[PDB]
Design a protein around this ligand. Sequence first.
Ligand code: NA
Length: 421
Amino acid sequence: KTWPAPTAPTPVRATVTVPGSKSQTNRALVLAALAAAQGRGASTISGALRSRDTELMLDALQTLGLRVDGVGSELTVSGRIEPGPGARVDCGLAGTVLRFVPPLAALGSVPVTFDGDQARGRPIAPLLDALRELGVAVDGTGLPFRVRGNGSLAGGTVAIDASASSQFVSGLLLSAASFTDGLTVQHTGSSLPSAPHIAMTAAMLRQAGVDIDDSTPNRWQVRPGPVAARRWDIEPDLTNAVAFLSAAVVSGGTVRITGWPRVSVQPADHILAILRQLNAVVIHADSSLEVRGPTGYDGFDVDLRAVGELTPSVAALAALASPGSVSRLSGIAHLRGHETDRLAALSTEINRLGGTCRETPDGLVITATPLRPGIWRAYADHRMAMAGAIIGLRVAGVEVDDIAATTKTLPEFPRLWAEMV
Ligand code: NA
């Protein structure tokens, strides 16, 4: 039933390896597969996330004939795409396999069936139409569909709403180096404000030496060529990393996160700015980031438009500021429209534990005040669960209602969190 959040009555002192980003893990797996398939060599992936979804990707690559080896977050990909008879790739809840793997199957010379199990889910017929437009011999308007590999994918130019289909656009860009004519993707909107997943993809392609030109607004062009075999050092995912750094901040202790990049495409700078304003010590060394928390801090006003995903951890920091302190978190009105309304959730849960959190047109106003034991609801949301864990470091008797909200995303979280404390 409930998960007792461990308390840190003395400062935490810990070195933690935070698992890698799911997005980067799946991107690296595809780029490693393509390099191997092209005969460019075996690649290694260090820091890979191991979860149900990344296991499904690993299985899909092995179905295509690639050799996958490793242990935990350390993987090697090698061999060739040679699927053989009756090859079938399970996709299921990993909408990622469906979007990233069909182009790779098209490089083989046999049929590969993609299957999974609703009426109320997102239709994939348009995805299949786009694959056909680029030269994939695929028949279906849904699952199951069969890519009939004939050793090449022509490529060309496709128009798509890259905001609505950003994962599919990433999938096409990942494999585009192998298309005969390359790929041009034209976004059909006149503006595209935030496309972090497409930008991550483009940055990773450049790390693999692929010629990608994204200099024109709303357009991405990849030229055909080899994908380099690399040592892919996957960056800790920023959201999860911040939960661990927040434990240093609230406990007044030290957390050192290993395998941190010299420069990151994730918005690490923005959160480090906030931590610096709470007077935490922040040291960016060799291949690690260390944060040491202060004995306490007062309230802060921060606009989180650029790092909306960090709202629950930041709200936890605000609730643990010196009593009486007022914090205003703004730039997050838009978050109300996401599947999970974390503003309503955060206000309810802080208030359930004896706190003071007010919803506002642009965000949350939190008054730090002493809290009491209770059941912190996660609402089946991993970020909400980590926020309760942060609160629990300082408040004895906080229990997160169901930690499965986090373990489905980050299986290692409860054990790594307990080892840290
Ligand atoms: Na209280």
